[PDB]
Amino acid sequence: MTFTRYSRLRVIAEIRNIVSSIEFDRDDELFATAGVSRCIKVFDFSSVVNEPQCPIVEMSTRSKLSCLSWNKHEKNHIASSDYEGIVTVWDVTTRQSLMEYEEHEKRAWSVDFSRTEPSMLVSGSDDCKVKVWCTRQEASVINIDMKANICCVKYNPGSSNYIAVGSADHHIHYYDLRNISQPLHVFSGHKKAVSYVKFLSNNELASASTDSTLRLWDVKDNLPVRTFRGHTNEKNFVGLTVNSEYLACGSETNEVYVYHKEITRPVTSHRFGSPDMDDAEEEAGSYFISAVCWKSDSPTMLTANSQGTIKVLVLAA
């Protein structure tokens, strides 16, 4: 029943370079995109779905962007991490940078605003440090020296005391920020760098890696659960988004994949740029999906690829 509830992704809207990050605001009303074009763009979701297209805010940045995270309490605030290492908090109504955190010494691949302590945000960098910041303070409040490049950091959705850290050392380091001498647990299983970590719930953590797998982990009992396979991801950040039941990720075949958390093989997938009639130009391997984001626990998702095309997709029977 679960495997067969949905068999396809329907395209319900399309905006037609690399988009590194696509994220919904606190209420799933606006979404923002950012990437190599050094421009944070904010769109109204309903307008995109209903109309035959223009962002409502554009904020120019000095450096290429790697990640966005909206504040979970302050509707109008969004954080970005950039390739200079700067972690910026922006106000999308005034367009101003509210904070410019400059301690990282190399590109910051990831930033995440906490859901439960919403002034707290965490970043990770090629400088091998995890930094925790508070929007009321200019200096970092916690620093973890990880000794390998950090590709992704994510707060637990139920408590700001726990973060998952995906590392180029192939492991997920799960920290209690109240005692950083050692992580609570380090999860091994991926055979390549861990590019994303995202929580389905307080106790369920998912990861993506350039070993062409996603993995599901139990962070209450510190157990491996399941490995998901089907997509191609051997090189790039191709996006990971999860909700209470589903995982979605990109692929280096210009395809989005969806998995139900209980089944190791995809429930469906969607090709960007499938040829029609006599089309005979670039092959599928020439583009990658670069960012994905569920609309909370619904079957609706945002997706973007390395050409800059954005699609709103919906799981359907």
């Binding site: 590194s20 190599v36 192939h170 760098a193 350039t210 090189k235 950040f237």
Partner: peptide, 8 residues
């Protein structure tokens, strides 16, 4: 390459 994931 700008989105290449690092290896240790």
């Amino acid at each position: 390459e700008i989105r290449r994931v690092p290896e240790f």
